[PDB]
Amino acid sequence: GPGHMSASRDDWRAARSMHEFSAKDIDGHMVNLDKYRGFVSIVTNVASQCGKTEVNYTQLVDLHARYAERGLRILAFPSNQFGKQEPGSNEEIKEFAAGYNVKFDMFSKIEVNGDDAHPLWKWMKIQPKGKGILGNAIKWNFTKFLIDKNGVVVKRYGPMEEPLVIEKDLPHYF
């Protein structure tokens, strides 16, 4: 018969990267996370009212610009499920990033916790770098997943860690 390959993508065994998922940008248009194939990529949740917001962003922009020559990318997911982290309208969170000189796109309309969490973040939470010992779940906003250029989660950093912690493992992959 016609065709040589087909798949029903039944569960996590078919999911191999962010490339098997897609998320809205802050304007509401679909981002194809497939575009991260061949790029060293980072996945983290952002917020305007964290105790460390500028302590993250002021490094985050510099690292993006410093490795822009090598193909470094970072998809920033604004998030409120932890507490009082992000109570603004999405149109604030768009220009909030521009206040730190951000040249990467701002993202919107995902979830990271509960049964209706966006499946990108479920796939990372079920990865061996995102899983806990007991009940799982992200500790706080600004939790950082590290993806080598092949789209596979290599590493993960706690929400107290700066992007400057990633800057140590970054140059080994490119």
UniProtKB/Swiss-Prot annotation:
Subunit structure: Monomer. Has a tendency to form higher mass oligomers. Interacts with FUNDC1; this interaction promotes GPX4 recruitment into mitochondria through TOM/TIM complex where it is degraded by mitophagy.
Modified positions (Phosphoserine) in chain numbering: 17
Keyword Lipid metabolism: yes
One Pfam assignment: GSHPx
Disease linkage: Spondylometaphyseal dysplasia, Sedaghatian type: A form of spondylometaphyseal dysplasia, a group of short stature disorders distinguished by abnormalities in the vertebrae and the metaphyses of the tubular bones. SMDS is a neonatal lethal form characterized by severe metaphyseal chondrodysplasia with mild limb shortening, platyspondyly, cardiac conduction defects, and central nervous system abnormalities.
Tissues where this protein is expressed: Present primarily in testis. Expressed in platelets (at protein level).
Cleavable signal peptide: none
EC number: 1.11.1.12, 1.11.1.9
Record: active site: 50
InterPro entries: Glutathione_peroxidase, GPX_AS, GPX_CS, Thioredoxin-like_sf
Entry's family note: Belongs to the glutathione peroxidase family.
Any Gene Ontology biological process: multicellular organism growth
Top enzyme category: oxidoreductase
Primary gene name: GPX4
Any one of the GO CC terms: cytosol
Function description: Essential antioxidant peroxidase that directly reduces phospholipid hydroperoxide even if they are incorporated in membranes and lipoproteins. Can also reduce cholesterol hydroperoxide and thymine hydroperoxide. Plays a key role in protecting cells from oxidative damage by preventing membrane lipid peroxidation. Required to prevent cells from ferroptosis, a non-apoptotic cell death resulting from an iron-dependent accumulation of lipid reactive oxygen species.
Catalytic activity as recorded in UniProt: a hydroperoxy polyunsaturated fatty acid + 2 glutathione = a hydroxy polyunsaturated fatty acid + glutathione disulfide + H2O; 2 glutathione + H2O2 = glutathione disulfide + 2 H2O; tert-butyl hydroperoxide + 2 glutathione = tert-butanol + glutathione disulfide + H2O; cumene hydroperoxide + 2 glutathione = 2-phenylpropan-2-ol + glutathione disulfide + H2O
GO molecular function: glutathione peroxidase activity; identical protein binding; phospholipid-hydroperoxide glutathione peroxidase activity; selenium binding
Protein name: Phospholipid hydroperoxide glutathione peroxidase GPX4
Alphabetic keyword roster: Cytoplasm, Developmental protein, Dwarfism, Lipid metabolism, Mitochondrion, Oxidoreductase, Peroxidase, Phosphoprotein, Selenocysteine, Transit peptide
